[PDB]
Amino acid sequence: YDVARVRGLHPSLGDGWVHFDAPAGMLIPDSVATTVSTAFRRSGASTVGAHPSARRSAAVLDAAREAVADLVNADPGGVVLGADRAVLLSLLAEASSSRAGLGYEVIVSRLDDEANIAPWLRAAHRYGAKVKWAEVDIETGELPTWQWESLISKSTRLVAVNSASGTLGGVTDLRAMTKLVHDVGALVVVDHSAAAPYRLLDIRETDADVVTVNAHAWGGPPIGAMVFRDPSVMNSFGSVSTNPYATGPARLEIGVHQFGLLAGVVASIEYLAALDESARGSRRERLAVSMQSADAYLNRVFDYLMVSLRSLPLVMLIGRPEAQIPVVSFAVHKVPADRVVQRLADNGILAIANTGSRVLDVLGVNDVGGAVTVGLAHYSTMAEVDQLVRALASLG
Amino acid sequence: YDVARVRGLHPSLGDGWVHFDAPAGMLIPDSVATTVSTAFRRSGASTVGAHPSARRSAAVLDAAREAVADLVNADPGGVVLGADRAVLLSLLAEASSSRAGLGYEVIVSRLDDEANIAPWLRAAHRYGAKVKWAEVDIETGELPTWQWESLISKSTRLVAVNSASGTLGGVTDLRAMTKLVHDVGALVVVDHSAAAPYRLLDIRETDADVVTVNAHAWGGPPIGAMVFRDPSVMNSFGSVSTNPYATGPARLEIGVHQFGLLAGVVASIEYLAALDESARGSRRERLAVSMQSADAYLNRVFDYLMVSLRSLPLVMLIGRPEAQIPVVSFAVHKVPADRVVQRLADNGILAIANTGSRVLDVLGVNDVGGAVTVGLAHYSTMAEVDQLVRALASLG
C-alpha cells in the first residue's frame, strides 16, 4: 500500500487542513469529481430516446448497478439507487408498513445511525407495531450477541441493524442474529454505510436480506444504494415508481435518475478497487485485494492513534471494541467536545463534535459535554496522527 | 426575445438534432453544467465544521432555497429540497397520515403526472380514505371548473392537482376550487412541474398550500422542491430529519443534501431570469419579465406548430384547451406512436412516445397505437417546426 500515491489522487489535500472528519464523509478523489463533471454535462434527460445522450444515460445507470453489485457481491438486478441511504431506508419502512402493524414487533439498534432508526420508529408509531431495542454493553459499547434470543419473538417482522458504528468504530457480530431472525420469517436490514469505506460486505455470506451503503462515505457522490440479496423479495414490496410499467429495481426508484452523480458512483467504486495499484482481476477481485491492502495500512495508523490517545492523561476513550473500523470517539476531562473541536480547528485540524447519537446518550457522554469523533481515510498518515495528538496534548 | 442568443447558451444545438422532447427534460445550459462541475468539487461533506468547503455547502443550500422561493414568490423558509418532486410528494403523502384515512376523501386529478397521484393512492390504501377523481372533459381535455362543487365535500381533507398537463398542455383553472377546498379545511397541493419552465406560479396570488417543481424540467439538475405557503402548515407535518435539532424546512429533509446539484438549481433559475437579457430589477422581478417575453415568443412558435399539425389530415390532436403551455399530444391515423417517433428520429427529430399517462388511457388513445408528445423549449424555432411538420407529412 502506497499512501503517497493515494494522496496524489486527492487535490483537496495539503490545503492547510488535516482531516480527521472521515465519518462525516471522505474527500472526493479527482477521478470522481472529473467523472461527475463530464457525465452531468453529457448525460441525457432520460434513458429513453434516439439521441446518443439517452444511450449514455442508460449505460451509466446499468454501470452503477453493476458497480454497487460488485461492492457487496450481489446481482445488479437487486440494486436500488437513490439520493441517500436515509431516503432509501425511509422508502423501505413505508413499503413495509404491514410489518410495522398491530401485533408485530420491529427491532432497532441503540448503536445505529438515526437514518436506520427513525423510519422504523416512525412506521411503528403510524401503524402500531411494538418497538424493541438491541442494547449496548455500557463498558464496551458493543451489541452483545447473547441478547438476540430474548429480543426476537414469533412477532418479530423487521430487524434493522448496522454492520459497524460510525461513532464508536465497533464492527457488529450479526451471525447469530441473522439465523434467529430468519427462523421467524423476519426481514434483516443491514446498514453497511459506516463500514463500507473500509470493509467489504459479502451479501451472500452474511445472508442479510437488504444492505444499504452511502457513496458519500468513501468520497463518492451523494448517492445511496439499497441492495436486495434476493431480487424476488422486491416484488413483494409495492411499487413506488411513477412508471406504471416499471420492472426490477426500477419499481423502487422514485423520480428522475441522477445520471451525472451515478457516473461518479462508478468512478468512486473504481477508486476503491484501485487503492492497491498492483491489484489484478475482475473488479470484485481487485476490490478484495485493494481493500485488504488499505485495511492493513490503516490498522497500523489506527494502532498508533489509539496508543497515542491512551497515553494522553486527559483523554477518555468511549467504548472498546473487539474488531474495528478506524473510527474512535473520546472526551477530554473538563473540556467539552465543542471546545476540543474548536481548539483543533485553530490548529488546522478537523474533527467532529458528535451531536445526536443515541449510544452516546446511553453511555452518559452527552451529559458531561459530548464526544469528539475522529476517523481515518485512505489518505491518512502517521504524520497527521502525530499532529492531532500534539494538539490534544495542549488542552486542559 | 432573442432565440439566437438563447440557442448560444446550448453548445450542442445546430449539430443536426432537433429537440421537441422538452416534456422529458430540456437541455442543460452550459452555465448550469459548469456550476455543477465546480460546486461538486468544492462543496464539503456537510454544512458543519471549520473548513471553507462547509461554508460553501451551507451557502449553496441557502441560495437554492432563495432561488426556488423567487420562482414561486414564496419565502425561502417554506422551501423543502430533495431529489425530485416525486420523492417530496411521496414524503408529503406519508406525513399526511390520517388525512388520507377512513371517514375522509382524497381528490386526485386525471390530468396529473403519476408523481402527484401514486403517493396519494398508496396513502389511501394504508389509512382508508375514499379516493375521488377530478375528471377531464373528453372533448377539450380540460378539468372543468364546475365539477369541484360536487367533488368537494365536508369530508375532503387532501386535494392534489396540477397547474398544467405535461401531456396535453392544458392550463388548469384553480381559482374557484381553491376557495372551496379551504372552505372545508382541506389542503391544496399543486404540482407545477410541467408548467414551471414556461409560466410563473405566484403562491401568494393562487393560495395553494403546497407547490412542487422539478428543476430537470427546465434544464436544471435533477432536484425537486416542495414549497409551503405557510411555514406554520409546514411544521404541522411530522419531522423526518435524522437531526433532532432540525428547524424549518430542514425538518422535512432526509439524507445528505446534494450540494453540487443544488448550486446548479440556482444557476438554472438564473438562466430562466435572464431569458430576456434586458430584464431589470430583482431576480424575482426579472423572472416575471423574462418568462413573459419567452412565453410571448413560444406562443407564436407553438401557434405555428398547432396550425401546421391541424393541416395534416392524418394528425389527430388530443384535447383543445382554452389555455395551453407549449406541449401537445397527438395520434397519427392508423400509425402507432413508436413508428411516428422512429420516422422523426430518422430525420434527426426527437419526440416522445408517451407512456404511462392516465389521461391518455382514460380517453382511449392508448387502446391501440398510443400517442406522441412534443414540447417546445426556449431554444425552439420556426425552422425546427417546419422540419417536424415535413417529417410527419411523410407518413401515410
From Swiss-Prot, chains A, B:
GO cellular component: peptidoglycan-based cell wall; plasma membrane
InterPro entries referenced in this protein's UniProt entry, alphabetically: Aminotrans_V_dom, Cys_dSase-rel, PyrdxlP-dep_Trfase, PyrdxlP-dep_Trfase_major, PyrdxlP-dep_Trfase_small
Domain of life: Bacteria
Phenotype reported upon loss of the gene: Cells lacking this gene display impaired growth.
Subunit structure: Homodimer.
Function text: Is essential for optimal growth.
Listed NCBIfam families: am_tr_V_VC1184
UniProt-listed PANTHER family: CYSTEINE DESULFURASE, PYRIDOXAL PHOSPHATE (PLP)-DEPENDENT ASPARTATE AMINOTRANSFERASE SUPERFAMILY
Protein family per UniProt: Belongs to the class-V pyridoxal-phosphate-dependent aminotransferase family.
Further remark: Was identified as a high-confidence drug target.
Protein name in UniProt: Uncharacterized protein Rv3778c
Source organism per UniProt: Mycobacterium tuberculosis (strain ATCC 25618 / H37Rv)
